[PDB]
Amino acid sequence: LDKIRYESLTDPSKLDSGKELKIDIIPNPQERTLTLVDTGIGMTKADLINNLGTIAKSGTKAFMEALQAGADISMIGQFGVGFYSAYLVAEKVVVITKHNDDEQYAWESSAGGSFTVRADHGEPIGRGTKVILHLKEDQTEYLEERRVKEVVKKHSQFIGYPITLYLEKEKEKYIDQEELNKTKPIWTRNPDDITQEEYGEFYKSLTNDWEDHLAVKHFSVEGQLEFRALLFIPRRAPFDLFENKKKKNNIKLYVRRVFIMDSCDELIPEYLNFIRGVVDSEDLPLNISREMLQQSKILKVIRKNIVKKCLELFSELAEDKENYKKFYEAFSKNLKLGIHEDSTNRRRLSELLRYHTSQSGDEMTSLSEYVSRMKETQKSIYYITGESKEQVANSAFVERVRKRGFEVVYMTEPIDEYCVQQLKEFDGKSLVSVTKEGLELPEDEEEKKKMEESKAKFENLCKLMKEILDKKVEKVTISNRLVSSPCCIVTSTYGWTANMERIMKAQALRDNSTMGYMMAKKHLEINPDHPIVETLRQKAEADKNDKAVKDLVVLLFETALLSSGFSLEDPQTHSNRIYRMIKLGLGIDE
Amino acid sequence: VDYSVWDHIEVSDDEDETHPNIDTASLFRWRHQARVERMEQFQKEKEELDRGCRECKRKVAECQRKLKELEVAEGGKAELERLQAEAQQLRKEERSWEQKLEEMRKKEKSMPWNVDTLSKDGFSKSMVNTKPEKTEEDSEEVREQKHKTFVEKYEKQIKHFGMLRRWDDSQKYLSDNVHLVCEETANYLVIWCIDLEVEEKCALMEQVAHQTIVMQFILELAKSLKVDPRACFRQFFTKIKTADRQYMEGFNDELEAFKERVRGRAKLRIEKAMKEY
Amino acid sequence: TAQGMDYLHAKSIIHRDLKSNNIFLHEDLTVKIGDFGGSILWMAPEVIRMQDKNPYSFQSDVYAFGIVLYELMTGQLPYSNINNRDQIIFMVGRGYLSPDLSKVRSNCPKAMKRLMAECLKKKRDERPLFPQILASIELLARSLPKI
Ligand SMILES: Nc1ncnc2c1ncn2[C@@H]1O[C@H](COP(=O)(O)OP(=O)(O)OP(=O)(O)O)[C@@H](O)[C@H]1O
């Protein structure tokens, strides 16, 4: 077809035998035939005998070389042995040919060692050629319409030529279904001439949808390896984004508008799976089996380019604060995962995150914009991680760092821990949470002396309390996070944290030998402001040891264990202690 | 055919080749920093040799002028011999720079390729697509204008299809429908099936129960799910197409629940029948 | 760790540092080599050599691996009593010292002791090449389990 098309644009008066172009399919389950008439250029007897009757040579290369040196066409086919693959499922083929300046001819063979040609008379053909087959008996399955439609959709549907079908279903009509290919490619012509709507249209015809996209990028690159992209972004987050199992086919790959292969454990990283597109190119080192690309380093070079020129769109779209809201609510999982596993581009990705801070009631706040308003003496950003929005909204630790007018953020989600664990810096600053081995903040001088006076005056109560509590806690001290609660629990730097303590238990497929080592040792914090701690002092210097101090201390400690999100191992022990006094509430136990 | 050009492509950042005892990220760092320091070292060498060539050429022009002005003059046999010796020496080191120039030019072809050499950008373009609003829906008028056409354009087709329940035809026809149909005529067709139940069409009645139960389930799941039902069919199709014996028996007991609902709707039907007629 | 660093260096790859903090002890006992921040000030005066701006060589890496593994077996730091960077470097200029011999473990294996003694005699340039060191490691390991 393309050969005769190009030849026509030299002398258009030579096409006086037929004035159109078309491709047609003829199934016939009566003599078991698969006629495949087209309307190509034709063929002469001499070229037929000295060209077709020889293994492994392409006449296309000779014809193309005969055509000057440098022209304007991009043709497909350079190996030559493509018709000899038609015998994989076949027993006898006959080709019916005629040229405008030649006579009608028929060629016959049956996979033997010889072939025949013969002149014939009958139905007159203008310029097309026929290929007729006799199908094998065991493979009488490809004849029905559904398999043919499936295979033509899967492999080749983008040829901009009218392939048509003439089956016969229930006075009975002659089905002339032409819609086999009716969605022409869009990355070919000038990018400026496209009028929006087909960008919305092509996406629907791409994957069986009735919604629209959210963005688009259409860059193209020249040089030695040349290709074009048609990337999109979907509006609605699929429920089955993580179902995998089924072979992943989000991103395809074409060479000269013919399907080759698809896979996205080399083309794009896993955390950017939700992107579709077309990555058509012109020439690559292909295989004799036209599905695999040898020299697989190319599939590694293309990845750098694709990720680099998608991240620019991702960064650009941070301008309109309206669309960014609907995008960020849907695909935040992908970015939060990607920040964990990547090294080349991490600092560039450290600003597309939006959080809720304690100055914005119901609006997300950027951390880059957060860098604007801090105090002068302050160092490093402060953050917290929790289980629920309200549960962390009013926490015991915060009640001290909130009175001084600073700013904090909440990362309350399992992946938030994964993100915050690895990233440790932002533009010269540090990321430190509230519960890491007793943080201290610069402040006025006169508070130092009274606090150290409490240090030097309350050493004995701190000394004698560790005896009654066996080896659970490491140390108890007075720090500055407590203004309305007596006690709290904080972890250590080298060790695990409370929320991931539950992400690990809740994880399904894990060993049970790891808990021995990297449990984080625990720290208790007291507040020498609540009158209870002072009331303890009189009985401390009064009574050396008795039952009441043991009861009160174990009670307060077990309550403090709940205060930091820790879950007890024997709830009956505390439930009995809470039920022990409600009976005194109404009086007589016995 | 010659693939000897596509045979030296390397990246600073390969993943398949790695070691069980080596940090992958730091290895990427080392490879890339080595590759860049090497390009910069070869750079420095190449402008060094280029400026050496430039000064050599300016000295060649200078010596050509010197030879010309000596040819104009005469009597300087000693000076002519000295400058001839100088020119011969300049030609000797000229072959020196020339042989090393050709050596490096030849080995340039042996240099492994990389991304920034193969590719030069030609175009790029983005877009946003934030078209104004989607819709605003009333409660009264729209219930008629689209409803009538939804009735005539699909009642006969659904009558034609509803006679069968074979799975792939049902799946694809329902995919077409959820791509095109809506809900009002769906419910209204269900109630036509209810008030046509008189003929006691057993296979038709089973398929009616199937279609009404799937549409009711889809609607409740979408409403509690706050998603458009027309885009909520795939998970249902994959759950019901592989519905095994236990899942089919759950379908049967929920169908029995629908069956006492059938008794209830039939009772209210008969009561309204006596009251109206 | 010897196998890992041998593999790394097998591709003509320099390290420019292998400070004992650059090791991550992963699951079980497995070494991951780090780069970002016992011999952190103990390299050869090759570093102090600032002539031709390219003193870097594999010899420094070999010597650093030797001293680092020897100290890691040993378990404590050399040269912790006298610390004068300026005077140390002036003394390096002339009157350079020698390693102390009293600081040695009792159960120093014969093969490793012989290797480390043989490493540095006159010049730090005739050091051996990696896989025979690896072979010495493997023979000494699979020559004294009990028998
Ligand atoms: N439909 C046809 N009409 C006329 N000549 C044809 C037709 N198909 C093939 N030929 C001729 O017979 C030769 C057989 O080669 P074929 O087209 O099968 O392989 P190719 O296109 O070179 O390779 P590949 O199939 O791998 O792309 C062609 O080069 C061409 O000269």
Residue numbers in the entry:
A (entry chain B): 51 to 220, 273 to 692
B (entry chain C): 2 to 278
C (entry chain K): 560 to 596, 615 to 724
Paper text:
Activation of client protein kinases by the HSP90 molecular chaperone system is affected by phosphorylation at multiple sites on HSP90, the kinase-specific co-chaperone CDC37, and the kinase client itself. Removal of regulatory phosphorylation from client kinases and their release from the HSP90-CDC37 system depends on the Ser/Thr phosphatase PP5, which associates with HSP90 via its N-terminal TPR domain. Recruitment of kinases to the HSP90 system is mediated by CDC373, which functions as an adaptor able to interact independently with HSP90 and protein kinases and facilitate their association. We have determined the cryoEM structure of an HSP90–CDC37–BRAFV600E complex, and structures of HSP90–CDC37–BRAFV600E with PP5 bound in phosphatase-engaged and phosphatase-autoinhibited conformations.
The two structures are distinguished by whether the C-terminal phosphatase domain of PP5 is packed against the N-terminal TPR domain in a ‘closed’ conformation or is substantially separated from it in an ‘open’ conformation. In the PP5-open conformation, the two domains of PP5 are completely separated, with the C-terminus of the TPR domain at Arg150 more than 50 Å away from the N-terminus of the globular phosphatase domain at Tyr176. As with the closed complex, the cryoEM map suggests the presence of the HSP90 C-terminal MEEVD peptide bound into the concave face of the TPR, and the terminal helix of the TPR domain makes the equivalent interaction with the hydrophobic pocket formed by the C-terminal domains of the HSP90 dimer. However, the phosphatase domain of PP5 is no longer packed against its own TPR domain but is instead engaged with the ordered kinase C-lobe of BRAFV600E. The detached phosphatase domain binds down towards the middle of the complex, bridging between surface loops at 461–467 in the middle domain of one HSP90 monomer and 569–574 in the C-terminal domain of the other monomer. In this position, the substrate-binding cleft of the phosphatase domain docked into the cryoEM volume, would be in direct contact with the HSP90-bound C-lobe of the BRAFV600E close to several inter-helix loops, and the point at which the unstructured C-terminus of BRAFV600E would extend from the globular C-lobe. Although the resolution of the map in this region does not allow full modelling beyond the globular C-lobe, the early part of this BRAFV600E segment downstream of residue 721, including pSer729, would be well positioned to interact productively with the phosphatase active site, although much higher resolution will be required to confirm this. Based on the relative position of the C-lobe and PP5-phosphatase, pSer729 is most likely to be the residue bound at the active site of the catalytically inactivated PP5 in the structure of the complex with HSP90–CDC37–BRAFV600E.
